[PDB]
């Protein structure tokens, strides 16, 4: 990893991140067959089997009753698109003809591919353990509607198999049919690994995905299709990672403030977030929740990206002279703050605040001068601002300083723009 400190703009650029970009969705329909539980009745009063059975009928009945700020512009659009796309696909799946075809498709196997009337191909998987048990056991065990049988093993068995079903219904009921994530009950580890293996991607992408099975779950979601007879039908949208290992970097910045004649000329780069090159194009991810790190890998959702011109990288090289409209924000008010980076931290220390760096072994080592200072995780273990202590990162990597005259020193002494927002570097000067 390489972190470069930019004295010119009081910002840092960290390179060497790899890209794991979600390019599509793989629709998987699951049919959890509950069986003919409706005809089971308990006439011998309260019993252990009756308690789970009544809960099961209750769960089934309950389910029948359910069926130009870049970051502010883009945040949730990918999420809304993901849900909307799933809902669009769900409406296609809701057709009785498709449910009938899928049920017929799964009549002879536990996994089959069916083409919906809307033309989308979906992978269908059958879950049969519960229907088998109940029919071949519980149903029979329940003789002449008597449920208080002495065979406690039967009751324990039933409570064990229904655990998954009750959890699935609970998650959808508590989430009003749209869950935020794929729990182990919606798709087990074995089911996920099998589903991934059938994805239309290269062997290399599949391998990367198989190693990070846990990350795949967090970006997916489940949607309840409905209740058709004795089978509960739901759909799971799995993320398709069609682009992997592409150069990504993250830009972080802190307020660059210069003080002339007691006055303050501050400047803050708002072009912060993740940027990745893809097929020579630069994709910008402005929302916090759309990119997540795992070591050198940053998982970003392509549906959250906004394509930016390649020239946007010039803002990290010569923002002062470049013709590219590097958008920043300014304000005659100084803000002292710590911006933690992967390989260090930006420490903006101005008038009125006491700033020092320290280590767990030596405590306070030295006071920091006023202005924007970059501290490597080798020079100190912790940074302290007044009484606020910030713990430094222990990631290993290379640190470089790109010297340059601060842009804030190139403000207009005659007149400084006041509290600028959603503007550009030229507007500040």
């Amino acid at each position, epitope marked *: 990893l390489k972190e470069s400190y930019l004295e010119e703009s009081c910002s840092t650029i960290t390179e060497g991140y790899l890209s794991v970009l979600r390019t599509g969705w793989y629709t998987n329909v699951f049919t959890l067959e509950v069986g003919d539980v409706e005809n089971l009745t308990c006439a011998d009063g309260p019993s252990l089997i009756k308690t789970e059975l009544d809960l099961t009928k209750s769960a089934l009945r309950e389910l029948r009753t359910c069926s130009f700020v870049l970051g502010a512009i883009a945040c949730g659009v990918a999420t809304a698109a993901a849900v909307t796309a799933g809902v669009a696909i769900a409406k296609c799946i809701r057709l009785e003809s498709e449910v009938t075809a899928i049920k017929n498709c799964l*009549k*002879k*196997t*536990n*996994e*089959c*591919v*069916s*083409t919906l009337g809307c033309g989308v*191909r979906v*992978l269908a998987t059958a879950v049969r353990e519960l229907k*088998d048990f109940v029919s071949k056991n519980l149903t029979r065990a329940i003789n002449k509607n008597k449920c208080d049988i002495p065979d406690l093993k039967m009751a324990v068995s039933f409570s064990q198999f229904n655990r998954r079903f009750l959890n699935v219904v609970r998650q959808f009921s508590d989430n009003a049919g749209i869950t935020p994530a794929i729990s182990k009950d919606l798709m087990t580890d074995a089911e996920l690994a*099998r589903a991934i*293996s*059938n994805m*239309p991607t290269s062997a290399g992408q599949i391998k990367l995905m198989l190693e990070n099975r846990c990350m795949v779950r967090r970006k997916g979601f489940g949607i309840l299709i409905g209740v058709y007879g004795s089978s509960v039908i739901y759909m799971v949208q799995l993320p398709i990672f069609g682009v992997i290992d592409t150069p990504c970097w993250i830009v972080k910045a802190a307020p660059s403030c210069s003080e002339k004649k007691g006055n303050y000329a501050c400047l803050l780069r708002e072009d912060q977030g993740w940027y990745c090159q893809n097929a020579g194009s630069t994709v910008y991810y402005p929302c916090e929740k759309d990119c997540e790190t795992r070591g050198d890998h940053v998982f970003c959702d392509t549906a959250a990206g906004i394509n930016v011109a390649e020239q946007s990288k010039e803002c990290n090289i010569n923002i002062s002279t470049t013709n590219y409209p590097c958008k920043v924000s300014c304000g005659r008010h100084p803000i002292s703050m710590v911006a933690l980076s992967p390989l260090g931290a930006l420490v903006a220390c101005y008038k009125g605040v006491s700033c020092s760096i320290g280590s767990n072994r030596v405590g306070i080592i030295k006071q920091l001068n006023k202005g924007c200072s970059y501290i490597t995780n080798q020079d100190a273990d912790t940074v302290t601002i007044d009484n606020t202590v910030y713990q430094l990162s222990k990631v290993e990597g290379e640190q470089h300083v790109i010297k340059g005259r601060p842009v804030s020193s190139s403000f207009d002494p005659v007149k400084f723009p006041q509290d600028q927002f959603n503007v550009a570097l030229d507007q500040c000067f």
Partner: antibody, heavy 119, light 108 residues
Framework: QGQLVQSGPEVKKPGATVKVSCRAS????????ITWVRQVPGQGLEWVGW????????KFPQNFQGRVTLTADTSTSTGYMELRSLTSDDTAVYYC??????????????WGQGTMVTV | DIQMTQSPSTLSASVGDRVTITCRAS??????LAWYQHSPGKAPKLLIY???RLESGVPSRFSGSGSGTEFTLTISSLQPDDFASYYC?????????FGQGTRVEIKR
């Protein structure tokens, strides 16, 4: 109902390589897989191999591992089976059948008319 | 792999006779057994799937039963067109091992 049309009988000399065709019809080929089964004269049914027409993944039994190459053209809905290092004892009827799309096993519901391969 | 043993290997019967064919799995395969009809010189025909479900277009005289490791194919009344070799197949493991087959011959 879908239909399968296999190539005609072929007679080849020992050690040659033979390529057998399997044309699918009347069904959505791209949603299934093709399994190959042979019947040696006087012997039972033996699995030869399987290919997913959706993913292209292949699996083979130990006696056919490395010897058989399977291909599935989804554009023409035609499968081909190529058997290498033919021996006189490999003279048998090779059948292509509609196998599972994926790892879940299933019965074979569509069968070709069969191809007599003579070594 | 699961070895599949059919019994008997050959059975001679007359038209209308009740025919019974057994298939044994070396380990439990639940209900994942399939049955195929293979007439000489004709392609194999699927008869039963999931141990007991009758295939579309198969005459109702054919019935399948059993579970776990032992499965049985029963023909309620053998017709002239039923004299053929029958093969059971387990649909539980990836290898889908076939049985050695049972030949149904006309009783002299």
């Amino acid at each position: 109902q879908g239909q399968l049309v296999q190539s005609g009988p072929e007679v080849k000399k020992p050690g040659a390589t033979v390529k057998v065709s399997c044309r699918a019809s009347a069904y959505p080929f791209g949603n299934y897989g093709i399994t190959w089964v042979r019947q040696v004269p006087g012997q039972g049914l033996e699995w030869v191999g399987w290919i997913s027409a959706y993913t292209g993944h292949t699996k083979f039994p130990q006696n056919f591992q490395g010897r058989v190459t399977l291909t599935a053209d989804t554009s023409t809905s035609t499968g081909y089976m190529e058997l290498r290092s033919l021996t006189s004892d490999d003279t048998a009827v090779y059948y292509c059948a509609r196998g599972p799309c994926c790892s879940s096993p299933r019965p074979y519901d569509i069968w070709g008319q069969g191809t007599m391969v003579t070594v | 792999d699961i070895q599949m043993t059919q019994s008997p290997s050959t059975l001679s019967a007359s038209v209308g006779d009740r025919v019974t064919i057994t298939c044994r799995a070396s380990q439990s395969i639940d209900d994942w057994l399939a049955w195929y009809q293979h007439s000489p010189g004709k392609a194999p025909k699927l008869l039963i799937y999931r141990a007991s479900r009758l295939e579309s277009g198969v005459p109702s005289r054919f019935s399948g039963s059993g579970s776990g490791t032992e499965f049985t194919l029963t023909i309620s009344s053998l017709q002239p067109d039923d004299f053929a070799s029958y093969y059971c197949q387990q649909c539980y493991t990836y290898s889908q091992t076939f049985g050695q087959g049972t030949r149904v011959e006309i009783k002299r």
